Amino acid sequence: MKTRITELLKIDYPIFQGGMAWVADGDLAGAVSKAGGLGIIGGGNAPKEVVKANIDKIKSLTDKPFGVNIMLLSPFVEDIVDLVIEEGVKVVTTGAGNPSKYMERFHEAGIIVIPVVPSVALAKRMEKIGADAVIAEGMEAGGHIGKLTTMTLVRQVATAISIPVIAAGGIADGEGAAAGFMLGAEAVQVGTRFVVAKESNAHPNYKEKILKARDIDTTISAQAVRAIKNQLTRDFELAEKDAFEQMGAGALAKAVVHGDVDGGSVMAGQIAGLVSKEETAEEILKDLYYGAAKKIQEEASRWTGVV
Amino acid sequence: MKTRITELLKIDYPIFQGGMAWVADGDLAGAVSKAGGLGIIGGGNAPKEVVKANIDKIKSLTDKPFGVNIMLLSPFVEDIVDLVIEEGVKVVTTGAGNPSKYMERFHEAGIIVIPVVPSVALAKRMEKIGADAVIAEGMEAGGHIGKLTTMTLVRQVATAISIPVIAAGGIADGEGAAAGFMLGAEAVQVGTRFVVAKESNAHPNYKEKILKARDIDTTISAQHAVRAIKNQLTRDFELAEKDAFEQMGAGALAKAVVHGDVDGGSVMAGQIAGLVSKEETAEEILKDLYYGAAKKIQEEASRWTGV
Ligand SMILES: O=C(O)COc1ccc(-c2c[nH]c(CNC(=O)Nc3ncc(Sc4ccccn4)s3)n2)cc1
Ligand SMILES: O=C(O)COc1ccc(-c2c[nH]c(CNC(=O)Nc3ncc(Sc4ccccn4)s3)n2)cc1
Ligand SMILES: Cc1cc2nc3c(=O)[nH]c(=O)nc-3n(C[C@H](O)[C@H](O)[C@H](O)COP(=O)(O)O)c2cc1C
Ligand SMILES: Cc1cc2nc3c(=O)[nH]c(=O)nc-3n(C[C@H](O)[C@H](O)[C@H](O)COP(=O)(O)O)c2cc1C
Numbered sequence: 001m002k003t004r005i006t007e008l009l010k011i012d013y014p015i016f017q018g019g020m021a022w023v024a025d026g027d028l029a030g031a032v033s034k035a036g037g038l039g040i041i042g043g044g045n046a047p048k049e050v051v052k053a054n055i056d057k058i059k060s061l062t063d064k065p066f067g068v069n070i071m072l073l074s075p076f077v078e079d080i081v082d083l084v085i086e087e088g089v090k091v092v093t094t095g096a097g098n099p100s101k102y103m104e105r106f107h108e109a110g111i112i113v114i115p116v117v118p119s120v121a122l123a124k125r126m127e128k129i130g131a132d133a134v135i136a137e138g139m140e141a142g143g144h145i146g147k148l149t150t151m152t153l154v155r156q157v158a159t160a161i162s163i164p165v166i167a168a169g170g171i172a173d174g175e176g177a178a179a180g181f182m183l184g185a186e187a188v189q190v191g192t193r194f195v196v197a198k199e200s201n202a203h204p205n206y207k208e209k210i211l212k213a214r215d216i217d218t219t220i221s222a223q224a225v226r227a228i229k230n231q232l233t234r235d236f237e238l239a240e241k242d243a244f245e246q247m248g249a250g251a252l253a254k255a256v257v258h259g260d261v262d263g264g265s266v267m268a269g270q271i272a273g274l275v276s277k278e279e280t281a282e283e284i285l286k287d288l289y290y291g292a293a294k295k296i297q298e299e300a301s302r303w304t305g306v307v
Numbered sequence: 308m309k310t311r312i313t314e315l316l317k318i319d320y321p322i323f324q325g326g327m328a329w330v331a332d333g334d335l336a337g338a339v340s341k342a343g344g345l346g347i348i349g350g351g352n353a354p355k356e357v358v359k360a361n362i363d364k365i366k367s368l369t370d371k372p373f374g375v376n377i378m379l380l381s382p383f384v385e386d387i388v389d390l391v392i393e394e395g396v397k398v399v400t401t402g403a404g405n406p407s408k409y410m411e412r413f414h415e416a417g418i419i420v421i422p423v424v425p426s427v428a429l430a431k432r433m434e435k436i437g438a439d440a441v442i443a444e445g446m447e448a449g450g451h452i453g454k455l456t457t458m459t460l461v462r463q464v465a466t467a468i469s470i471p472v473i474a475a476g477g478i479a480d481g482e483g484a485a486a487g488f489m490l491g492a493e494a495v496q497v498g499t500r501f502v503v504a505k506e507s508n509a510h511p512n513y514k515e516k517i518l519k520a521r522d523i524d525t526t527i528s529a530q531h532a533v534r535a536i537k538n539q540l541t542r543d544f545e546l547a548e549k550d551a552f553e554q555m556g557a558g559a560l561a562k563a564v565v566h567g568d569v570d571g572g573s574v575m576a577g578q579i580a581g582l583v584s585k586e587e588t589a590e591e592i593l594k595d596l597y598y599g600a601a602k603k604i605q606e607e608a609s610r611w612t613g614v
């Protein structure tokens with residue numbers, strides 16, 4: 001099977017493992033790319049030399065295509081722009097801001113640019129400035145969120161633009177992934193579920209937090225970031241009532257690296273209640289792709305001959 | 308095609324026009340039922356005598372199945388429970404609370420009860436007291452909302468229960484409706500788009516504000532949290548909360564729906580309002596949703612064939 005995304009990136013499955021701060025090292029990314037998806041290295045707030053070690057890690061693991069995520073609120077944003085170009089990266093995703101100022105530089109470098117868009121207006125602007133595709137991220141996602149859900153944003157983005165759309169936010173199995181294709185997308189982007197992958201270097205405490213979570217276990221803090229509820233999210237809310245960087249500084253690192261799941265930031269999506277097994281990256285990819293195929297096929301049998 | 312909902316309810320299409328305070332009178336619920344879906348009179352906050360007039364109006368328009376919505380925050384809840392049983396209404400949907408104390412009375416009346424549920428724990432419990440089906444409503448929906456999205460709530464509720472699930476929130480076309488079926492749903496509930504139906508008695512001003520809205524033109528107010536299209540009321544209400552209500556809130560929806568005061572009334576509508584761009588008959592809407600979905604499911608299955 002083929003979609004414009006499998007053709008554009010030269011990959012087996014129309015699935016991205018979304019770039020994540022701290023979680024998406026060369027190990028996670030490498031395992032995804034290896035099995036046939038697009039593994040994506042999360043730039044995050046990391047210095048150039050930390051992100052570079054990751055790019056080196058991945059190349060030594062596989063020759064398959066890979067992306068690098070540039071998170072536009074990073075203090076080292078300009079260094080990572082240099083880096084993706086310098087290291088020969090073919091795909092760039094961008095998140096948490098407008099990447100417009102870097103678009104011509106990326107395209108002169110032969111790089112494929114796929115921004116994350118939170119609205120139809122920004123989706124269209126990206127199309128008119130040359131963007132090769134866009135990612136519509138719903139508010140149900142883990143991490144730094146917009147306002148619109150996946151249901152409404154994907155459909156309205158897909159309708160507004162002629163470039164290919166990718167659904168992100170709230171997908172953790174084949175049924176969820178196939179829904180993304182119905183809303184008009186040609187690829188899915190998955191975050192929360194890849195965190196529990198065997199190759200993921202997220203601390204056992206962070207993985208077990210996700211695994212035990214119920215549907216309602218997430219909250220939005222710092223109004224904006226979706227995370228699993230703990231002492232830190234309760235602290236922040238209370239200090240929101242009172243009125244602050246003592247809490248917020250290094251919070252994700254505390255969680256992802258050191259396993260402090262009380263005082264750390266345990267970002268994860270509303271779909272974490274559906275995630276309850278540790279698997280390899282390949283086992284996750286196959287479940288999403290063949291799980292979707294199966295469900296699309298079963299529904300077509302139901303609706304067959306209707307006109 | 309057949310779903311467990313089409314067979315429980317004996318309806319031609321697995322689509323509910325969602326029970327809506329003020330909007331969902333007899334003429335709208337009639338046209339939906341007459342065209343072959345499930346039209347639903349919304350009880351809202353209305354006295355027993357007003358809802359009876361609606362029930363009286365619908366029976367004279369169509370012989371086909373119809374539902375009545377019981378909104379549980381109503382001052383007149385006990386009377387609307389009475390009313391449905393006395394007038395031989397065969398289906399009841401509920402919203403804004405827990406209907407558990409009414410379950411045994413409804414079933415002794417031979418009534419089919421379909422509660423809206425905001426979580427997995429409430430879906431499971433409704434299943435355990437004998438509910439015939441539930442509605443999963445996402446926070447993207449118009450009106451009074453929970454915290455989970457359609458993408459994530461419908462997945463996790465379809466998964467937790469063996470009774471049929473109906474997907475609500477963010478569906479205005481066949482691609483949207485197909486997506487809901489993909490997540491585990493056996494029918495869809497549509498609100499926003501039915502407001503602009505030719506047979507809807509919503510004020511031309513109110514229909515105009517939907518037709519001209521963008522994806523981003525809704526906001527959450529009063530977080531009883533209501534989703535509505537941004538205007539002077541939402542601006543004044545947000546500010547009134549900001550520094551710190553019944554003077555502003557009282558009768559707000561009636562002012563917009565009936566009188567067309569879309570400046571200072573509550574224009575409840577979903578994030579999918581940016582997609583709703585024309586006035587159509589109820590039948591034209593039902594047919595677009597149904598056959599739109601069919602063609603999208605059929606299209607994607609030829610794309611995925613052999614996988
Ligand atoms: O320019 C504007 O204001 C509008 O433009 C945009 C606004 C928002 C977005 C957007 C929303 N979501 C995303 C992708 N998701 C994310 O970026 N989620 C993230 N999680 C953890 C992150 S790390 C971090 C975060 C904050 C501070 C320091 N570090 S980023 N992009 C894209 C474009
Ligand atoms: O266990 C509990 O605490 C109660 O559980 C529930 C909690 C929430 C819900 C729920 C949320 N949304 C829905 C279905 N949607 C709606 O109920 N939407 C509505 N729009 C306009 C309405 S009219 C109104 C509303 C408030 C005050 C005065 N009038 S109701 N049900 C259902 C059950
Ligand atoms: C822990 C965590 C960190 C993330 N970091 C980034 C990031 O640095 N840049 C970005 O564009 N998106 C970031 N995201 C979003 C993901 O790339 C992806 O779009 C999202 O997880 C999809 O939603 P889901 O969690 O339901 O699967 C992050 C998400 C999580 C959960
Ligand atoms: C104006 C308006 C009034 C509503 N009133 C009720 C109600 O009284 N009881 C209820 O259970 N749901 C109510 N709802 C929810 C709808 O029946 C339906 O589930 C919802 O609108 C679906 O989301 P959508 O707007 O994206 O289609 C209302 C929705 C709107 C837009």
Ligand SMILES: [Ca+2]
Nearest residue numbers: 158159161162
């Ligand atoms: Ca398109």
Ligand SMILES: [Ca+2]
Nearest residue numbers: 027199200201
């Ligand atoms: Ca490891």
Ligand SMILES: [Ca+2]
Nearest residue numbers: 465466468469
């Ligand atoms: Ca089920």
Ligand SMILES: [Ca+2]
Nearest residue numbers: 334506507508
């Ligand atoms: Ca009329």
